[PDB]
Scaffold this motif. Structure first.
Motif, PDB file in Angstrom:
ATOM      1  N   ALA A   1       0.818  -1.207   0.000  1.00  0.00           N
ATOM      2  CA  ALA A   1       0.000   0.000   0.000  1.00  0.00           C
ATOM      3  C   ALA A   1       0.856   1.264   0.000  1.00  0.00           C
ATOM      4  O   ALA A   1       0.478   2.283  -0.578  1.00  0.00           O
ATOM      5  CB  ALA A   1      -0.944  -0.004   1.190  1.00  0.00           C
ATOM      6  N   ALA A   2       2.014   1.206   0.643  1.00  0.00           N
ATOM      7  CA  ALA A   2       2.876   2.379   0.724  1.00  0.00           C
ATOM      8  C   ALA A   2       3.269   2.899  -0.652  1.00  0.00           C
ATOM      9  O   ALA A   2       3.456   4.107  -0.831  1.00  0.00           O
ATOM     10  CB  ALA A   2       4.121   2.078   1.547  1.00  0.00           C
ATOM     11  N   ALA A   3       3.385   1.993  -1.617  1.00  0.00           N
ATOM     12  CA  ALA A   3       3.773   2.361  -2.968  1.00  0.00           C
ATOM     13  C   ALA A   3       2.738   3.200  -3.710  1.00  0.00           C
ATOM     14  O   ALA A   3       3.036   3.713  -4.784  1.00  0.00           O
ATOM     15  CB  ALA A   3       4.126   1.120  -3.774  1.00  0.00           C
ATOM     16  N   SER A   4       1.536   3.340  -3.147  1.00  0.00           N
ATOM     17  CA  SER A   4       0.519   4.215  -3.723  1.00  0.00           C
ATOM     18  C   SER A   4       0.351   5.542  -2.976  1.00  0.00           C
ATOM     19  O   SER A   4      -0.490   6.360  -3.353  1.00  0.00           O
ATOM     20  CB  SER A   4      -0.831   3.499  -3.803  1.00  0.00           C
ATOM     21  N   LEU A   5       1.145   5.758  -1.930  1.00  0.00           N
ATOM     22  CA  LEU A   5       1.074   6.997  -1.152  1.00  0.00           C
ATOM     23  C   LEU A   5       1.977   8.068  -1.770  1.00  0.00           C
ATOM     24  O   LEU A   5       2.985   8.487  -1.193  1.00  0.00           O
ATOM     25  CB  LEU A   5       1.408   6.736   0.312  1.00  0.00           C
ATOM     26  N   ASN A   6       1.600   8.483  -2.972  1.00  0.00           N
ATOM     27  CA  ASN A   6       2.313   9.513  -3.704  1.00  0.00           C
ATOM     28  C   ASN A   6       1.360  10.169  -4.693  1.00  0.00           C
ATOM     29  O   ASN A   6       0.286   9.631  -4.998  1.00  0.00           O
ATOM     30  CB  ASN A   6       3.568   8.955  -4.391  1.00  0.00           C
ATOM     31  N   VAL A   7       1.750  11.340  -5.175  1.00  0.00           N
ATOM     32  CA  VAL A   7       0.894  12.146  -6.017  1.00  0.00           C
ATOM     33  C   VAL A   7       0.501  11.430  -7.303  1.00  0.00           C
ATOM     34  O   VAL A   7      -0.672  11.430  -7.678  1.00  0.00           O
ATOM     35  CB  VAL A   7       1.579  13.488  -6.349  1.00  0.00           C
ATOM     36  N   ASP A   8       1.469  10.833  -7.989  1.00  0.00           N
ATOM     37  CA  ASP A   8       1.171  10.171  -9.254  1.00  0.00           C
ATOM     38  C   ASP A   8       0.155   9.048  -9.069  1.00  0.00           C
ATOM     39  O   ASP A   8      -0.780   8.907  -9.867  1.00  0.00           O
ATOM     40  CB  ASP A   8       2.455   9.657  -9.893  1.00  0.00           C
ATOM     41  N   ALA A   9       0.325   8.238  -8.026  1.00  0.00           N
ATOM     42  CA  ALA A   9      -0.619   7.157  -7.789  1.00  0.00           C
ATOM     43  C   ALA A   9      -2.009   7.695  -7.482  1.00  0.00           C
ATOM     44  O   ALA A   9      -3.000   7.124  -7.919  1.00  0.00           O
ATOM     45  CB  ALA A   9      -0.134   6.236  -6.685  1.00  0.00           C
ATOM     46  N   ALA A  10      -2.078   8.778  -6.716  1.00  0.00           N
ATOM     47  CA  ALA A  10      -3.361   9.362  -6.358  1.00  0.00           C
ATOM     48  C   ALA A  10      -4.085   9.923  -7.583  1.00  0.00           C
ATOM     49  O   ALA A  10      -5.299   9.752  -7.731  1.00  0.00           O
ATOM     50  CB  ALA A  10      -3.149  10.438  -5.323  1.00  0.00           C
ATOM     51  N   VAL A  11      -3.336  10.608  -8.445  1.00  0.00           N
ATOM     52  CA  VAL A  11      -3.898  11.144  -9.675  1.00  0.00           C
ATOM     53  C   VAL A  11      -4.413  10.005 -10.553  1.00  0.00           C
ATOM     54  O   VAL A  11      -5.550  10.031 -11.029  1.00  0.00           O
ATOM     55  CB  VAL A  11      -2.866  12.004 -10.425  1.00  0.00           C
ATOM     56  N   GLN A  12      -3.591   8.986 -10.764  1.00  0.00           N
ATOM     57  CA  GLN A  12      -4.004   7.859 -11.593  1.00  0.00           C
ATOM     58  C   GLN A  12      -5.211   7.153 -10.993  1.00  0.00           C
ATOM     59  O   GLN A  12      -6.105   6.731 -11.722  1.00  0.00           O
ATOM     60  CB  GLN A  12      -2.845   6.890 -11.826  1.00  0.00           C
ATOM     61  N   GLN A  13      -5.241   7.032  -9.669  1.00  0.00           N
ATOM     62  CA  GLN A  13      -6.385   6.429  -9.005  1.00  0.00           C
ATOM     63  C   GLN A  13      -7.686   7.147  -9.379  1.00  0.00           C
ATOM     64  O   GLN A  13      -8.670   6.518  -9.776  1.00  0.00           O
ATOM     65  CB  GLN A  13      -6.199   6.476  -7.482  1.00  0.00           C
ATOM     66  N   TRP A  14      -7.704   8.466  -9.205  1.00  0.00           N
ATOM     67  CA  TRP A  14      -8.906   9.244  -9.490  1.00  0.00           C
ATOM     68  C   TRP A  14      -9.278   9.240 -10.977  1.00  0.00           C
ATOM     69  O   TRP A  14     -10.462   9.206 -11.319  1.00  0.00           O
ATOM     70  CB  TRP A  14      -8.797  10.669  -8.900  1.00  0.00           C
ATOM     71  N   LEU A  15      -8.282   9.269 -11.858  1.00  0.00           N
ATOM     72  CA  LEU A  15      -8.549   9.180 -13.293  1.00  0.00           C
ATOM     73  C   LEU A  15      -9.121   7.809 -13.673  1.00  0.00           C
ATOM     74  O   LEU A  15     -10.142   7.717 -14.365  1.00  0.00           O
ATOM     75  CB  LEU A  15      -7.274   9.455 -14.094  1.00  0.00           C
ATOM     76  N   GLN A  16      -8.470   6.741 -13.219  1.00  0.00           N
ATOM     77  CA  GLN A  16      -8.880   5.399 -13.612  1.00  0.00           C
ATOM     78  C   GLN A  16     -10.247   5.039 -13.061  1.00  0.00           C
ATOM     79  O   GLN A  16     -10.976   4.268 -13.678  1.00  0.00           O
ATOM     80  CB  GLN A  16      -7.840   4.366 -13.180  1.00  0.00           C
ATOM     81  N   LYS A  17     -10.600   5.607 -11.908  1.00  0.00           N
ATOM     82  CA  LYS A  17     -11.908   5.371 -11.312  1.00  0.00           C
ATOM     83  C   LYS A  17     -13.001   6.256 -11.907  1.00  0.00           C
ATOM     84  O   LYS A  17     -14.161   6.158 -11.511  1.00  0.00           O
ATOM     85  CB  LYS A  17     -11.843   5.504  -9.790  1.00  0.00           C
ATOM     86  N   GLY A  18     -12.649   7.091 -12.881  1.00  0.00           N
ATOM     87  CA  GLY A  18     -13.661   7.768 -13.671  1.00  0.00           C
ATOM     88  C   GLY A  18     -13.701   9.284 -13.656  1.00  0.00           C
ATOM     89  O   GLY A  18     -14.626   9.864 -14.220  1.00  0.00           O
ATOM     90  N   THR A  19     -12.725   9.946 -13.049  1.00  0.00           N
ATOM     91  CA  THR A  19     -12.730  11.404 -13.075  1.00  0.00           C
ATOM     92  C   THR A  19     -12.175  11.896 -14.405  1.00  0.00           C
ATOM     93  O   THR A  19     -11.052  11.549 -14.754  1.00  0.00           O
ATOM     94  CB  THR A  19     -11.849  12.005 -11.952  1.00  0.00           C
ATOM     95  N   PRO A  20     -12.941  12.712 -15.149  1.00  0.00           N
ATOM     96  CA  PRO A  20     -12.355  13.301 -16.359  1.00  0.00           C
ATOM     97  C   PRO A  20     -11.128  14.132 -16.006  1.00  0.00           C
ATOM     98  O   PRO A  20     -11.155  14.878 -15.027  1.00  0.00           O
ATOM     99  CB  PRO A  20     -13.474  14.204 -16.889  1.00  0.00           C
ATOM    100  N   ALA A  21     -10.065  14.007 -16.790  1.00  0.00           N
ATOM    101  CA  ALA A  21      -8.844  14.740 -16.487  1.00  0.00           C
ATOM    102  C   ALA A  21      -9.093  16.238 -16.355  1.00  0.00           C
ATOM    103  O   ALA A  21      -8.525  16.892 -15.482  1.00  0.00           O
ATOM    104  CB  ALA A  21      -7.779  14.466 -17.529  1.00  0.00           C
TER     105      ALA A  21
END
Length: 369
Positions: free
Chosen positions: A216-236
């Protein structure tokens, strides 16, 4: 591009140069200014400080100097907790009371929209039923704002939300693909990834993982958070990347181990102005005498230490790197927490007024011509 900036209604109580007053507001610095925070009384939108109405007048008065500026009022925040949100969303009746109060309040005080900052549906005491009830609240607000625009002929009130970066909170509370359709923009709180609640040092807002990390620690960063929100359906175009003008501090177990991941015994010493152990404003670390600044090569952000004190923070260079990143990902802009934590008065850092936020404005090509 948007540059969304938070004002905080308690910064007026800091001492000396750090006191943030209406004169420190710059009408042209940001495209959107969000007022933190309103609260709730009997399920109706309400003020939280004795002089909020005075400050609303000044805040929204900036629009006379810059008529392009949009303002929003944020409800909630960390310290507000969850119970009042839970109680308000529990029934259709209570949501309607809230929604109608919000429209009236925003129109009375000359705000252009509402920013939802519930921290967080489905966590921090809020029950699992609040995940879907939050979706409903977002839709209720979006639809009521649409209706009010049609009936009144006024330009529609905006709806945004400040949202968490970590998967635990995201999956407990947020039906991303549904809410993103109804929010005008999404203020991603891409910070507070690490801090003195942990027993090893870690950066407040790293861009990428460190090679040593896993799980889980490997997702505690800005890039992972951005990709998370995009992949889960937020328009860029709707995703606005949050940026911190503060850092998070630790007391090291030993002044000899100053690495990222070194043992810590607790929060760093409180700053002389912000007086909150575990955080420091940019203006409290930018000129830190006798300290050693370093960089986390994997994460593209600085830290600084002195004796047994260690602070992970953002500087001009890391803000530049993060804007380059958001542009590469096609995001809608940057958000910044908060105006009063940058060197807003240019008293400390020898970089002029608002050195961090002006960097965002420059890098986003938003400088007034």
């Amino acid at each position: 591009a948007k540059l969304v900036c938070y004002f905080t209604n308690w910064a007026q109580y800091r001492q000396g140069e750090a006191r943030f007053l209406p004169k420190d507001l710059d009408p042209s610095l940001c495209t959107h200014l969000i007022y933190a925070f309103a609260g709730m009384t009997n399920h109706q939108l309400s003020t939280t400080e004795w002089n909020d109405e005075t400050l609303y007048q000044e805040f929204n008065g900036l629009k006379k100097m810059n008529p392009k500026l949009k303002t929003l009022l944020a409800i909630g925040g960390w310290n507000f907790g969850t119970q009042k949100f839970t109680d308000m969303v529990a029934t259709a009746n209570n949501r309607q009371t809230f929604v109608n109060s919000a429209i009236r309040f925003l129109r009375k005080y000359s705000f252009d929209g509402l920013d939802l900052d519930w921290e967080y549906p489905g966590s921090q005491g809020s029950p699992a039923v609040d995940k879907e009830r939050f979706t409903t609240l977002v839709q209720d607000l979006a639809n009521a704002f649409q209706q009010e625009a049609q009936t009144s002929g006024k330009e529609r009130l905006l709806l945004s939300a400040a949202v968490p970066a970590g998967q635990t909170y995201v999956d407990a509370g947020y039906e991303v693909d549904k809410i993103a359709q109804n929010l005008d923009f999404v203020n991603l709180m891409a910070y507070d990834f690490h801090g003195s609640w942990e027993k090893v040092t870690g950066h407040n807002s790293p861009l990428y993982k460190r090679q040593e990390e896993s799980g889980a620690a490997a997702s505690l960063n800005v890039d992972a958070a951005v990709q998370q929100w995009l992949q889960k359906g937020t328009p860029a175009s709707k995703l606005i990347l949050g940026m911190p003008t503060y850092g998070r501090s630790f007391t090291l177990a030993s002044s000899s181990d100053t690495r990222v991941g070194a043992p810590a015994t607790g929060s760093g010493t409180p700053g002389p102005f912000t007086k909150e152990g575990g955080m420091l404003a940019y203006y409290e670390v930018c000129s830190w005498k006798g300290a050693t600044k370093q960089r986390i090569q994997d994460q593209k952000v600085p830290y600084i230490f002195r004796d047994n004190q260690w602070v992970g923070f953002d500087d001009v260079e890391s803000f530049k790197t993060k804007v380059s990143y958001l542009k590469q990902k096609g995001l809608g802009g940057a958000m910044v927490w908060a105006l009063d934590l940058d060197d807003f008065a240019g008293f400390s850092c020898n970089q002029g007024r608002y050195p961090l936020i002006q960097t965002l404005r420059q890098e986003l090509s938003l400088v007034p011509r």
